[PDB]
Design a protein around this ligand. Structure first.
Ligand code: XOO
Lengths: 114, 392
């Protein structure tokens, strides 16, 4: 079974931190751009961070400086370090590749609440 | 590119014979191409099986299979028939495999080359105004965008037969895709609609265009086709006077309103069919230069080069009868038309490796600055009587 599985959500006291991990089993995170997204109840799913195959990172304004995206090639997993969190960060968090993104395929996501 | 499977198949025909034995190549680049006999040693996307959907059937003939593809905004179907059900299996299988192979390599490639393109309109936005066409898999209607008052053509296809504006063709004289959206059961393509009127009407009212007027429209057609042929690797195969309109300023628009497919009577307009298309021979870029020849003959003579109300006799004329010209046509125009209407595509103007360049170098177009044609820097010989003016 080919898929992405997010883990590491939960409740945390605002201004805390959290590491989310996206375990690709059946996919090679090394050959793909990977991004992190989030979606909250009334809102549209929000692109958060990307890491190209070179390793080049990039982040959307609401999270610049607070979150870091990293790729563990050896562990076929992407990670999102969440620092100095805020209620406005509360959401379900998803990771994904380009192809799955355009086909609207998503793993289970992990829920985070501040 | 290597051959992946090859052999004989009966190819369904739409014009003359119905079923014709053809020798087909399936190549790892997706091209699935039929030939009158085993061919003895640029590829057109028209013949690609990529993103095809395959279906098996038993009518009319047993052991038939259908390839169905969305080509830009058009659903096209290629129908085939073999002798045994096992034979079919090997073919549909060979085709799926090449096709999956292409999807696979491609997805892998864009997954690896995506560059923060990892980002994440409906029926009610529009006023129906007039059916433009109807067909197997959908319809084309004239609509008014409610928010803006602007007029568009909306192609509405049935989503089941199948299952993008950033991938437009940047040529001024082709129909541009404005929006593309899907409903619960439909796939919708909103495309520009010229409001300079139908060139078929303008030609009718005027009886004939002068050689200089035809020269202007031809240059613009030649430029749009050079672009399709060389930038996109596609043949239009649909050139006819009724698929030419004018924009507000008088420049050509080639329409993209076709659905299903053409062809006792024929379901469309057969007077523009090239010989090799009628014979279901293999065809390439040169079919569009034949259509160019028929269109410009009609413009400069005020009548078709071959007509009969019986399509059978018409077909005979197209394949067999030599072109005749009105007395008032000059030799440069006669030279271009007779070279575009060569029945053998290999000896047609434009049918060599140079393609459009041969036509732009013909003496009929001497003095045309093709860079200015492309940039709409040429001055239209006729400005239609009109932006959102429903004049036509
Ligand atoms: C009997 C019968 C009838 C008709 C056909 C197929 C006819 N299709 C007509 C066609 C072909 C190409 C395009 N096209 C355009 C285009 C052309 C003219 C005006 N505006 C525009 N936009 N632009 C593109 C881009 C890509 C492709 C494409 C083609 C093949 C495969 C993949 C992509 N096509 C166009 C429009 C209309 C067959 C038949 O048997």
């Amino acid at each position: 079974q080919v898929q992405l599985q997010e883990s590491g959500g939960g409740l945390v006291q605002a201004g805390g931190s959290l590491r989310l991990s996206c375990a690709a089993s059946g996919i090679d995170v090394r050959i793909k751009t990977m991004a992190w997204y989030r979606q909250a109840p009334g809102k549209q799913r929000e692109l958060l961070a990307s890491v190209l195959v070179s390793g080049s990172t990039n982040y959307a304004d609401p999270v610049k400086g607070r979150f870091t995206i990293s790729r563990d090639n050896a562990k076929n997993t992407v990670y999102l370090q969440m620092n100095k969190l805020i209620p406005d960060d509360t959401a379900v968090y998803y990771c994904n590749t380009y192809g799955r993104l355009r086909r609207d395929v998503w793993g289970p996501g992990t829920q985070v609440t501040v | 590119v290597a051959i992946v499977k090859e052999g004989w198949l009966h190819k369904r025909g739409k014009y003359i014979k119905t079923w014709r034995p053809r020798y087909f190549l399936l190549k790892n680049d997706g091209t699935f191409i039929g030939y009158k006999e085993r061919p003895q040693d640029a590829p057109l996307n028209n013949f690609s099986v990529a993103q095809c959907q395959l279906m098996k059937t038993e009518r009319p003939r047993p052991n038939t299979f259908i390839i169905r593809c969305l080509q830009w905004t058009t659903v096209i179907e290629r129908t085939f028939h073999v002798e045994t059900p096992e034979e079919r299996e090997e073919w549909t299988t060979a085709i799926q495999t090449v096709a999956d192979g292409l999807k696979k390599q491609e997805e892998e490639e864009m997954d690896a080359s995506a560059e923060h393109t990892d980002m994440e309109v409906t029926m009610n936005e529009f006023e129906y105004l007039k059916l433009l066409g109807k067909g197997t898999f959908g319809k084309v209607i004239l609509v008014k965008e409610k928010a803006t008052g602007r007029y568009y053509a909306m192609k509405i296809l049935k989503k089941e037969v199948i299952v993008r504006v950033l991938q437009n063709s940047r040529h001024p004289f082709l129909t541009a895709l404005k929006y593309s959206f899907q409903t619960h059961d439909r796939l919708c393509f909103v495309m520009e609609y010229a409001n300079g009127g139908e060139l078929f009407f303008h030609l009718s009212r005027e009886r004939v265009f002068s050689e200089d007027r035809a020269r202007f429209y031809g240059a613009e057609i030649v430029s749009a086709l050079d672009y399709l042929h060389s930038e996109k690797n596609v043949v239009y195969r649909d050139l006819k006077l009724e698929n030419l309109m004018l924009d507000k300023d008088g420049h050509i628009k080639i329409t993209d309103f076709g659905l299903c497919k053409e062809g006792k009577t024929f379901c469309g307009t057969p007077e523009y069919l090239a010989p090799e298309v009628l014979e279901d021979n293999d065809y390439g870029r040169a079919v569009d230069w034949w259509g160019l020849g028929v269109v410009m003959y009609e413009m400069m003579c005020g009548r078709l080069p071959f007509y009969n109300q019986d399509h059978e006799k018409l077909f005979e004329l197209i394949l067999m009868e030599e072109i005749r010209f009105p007395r008032t046509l000059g030799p440069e125009a006669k030279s271009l038309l007779s070279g575009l209407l060569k029945k053998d595509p290999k000896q047609r103007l434009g049918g060599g490796s140079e393609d459009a360049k041969e036509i732009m170098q013909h003496r009929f177009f001497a003095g045309i600055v093709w860079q200015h044609v492309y940039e709409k820097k040429l001055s239209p010989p006729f400005k239609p009587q009109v932006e959102t003016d429903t004049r036509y």
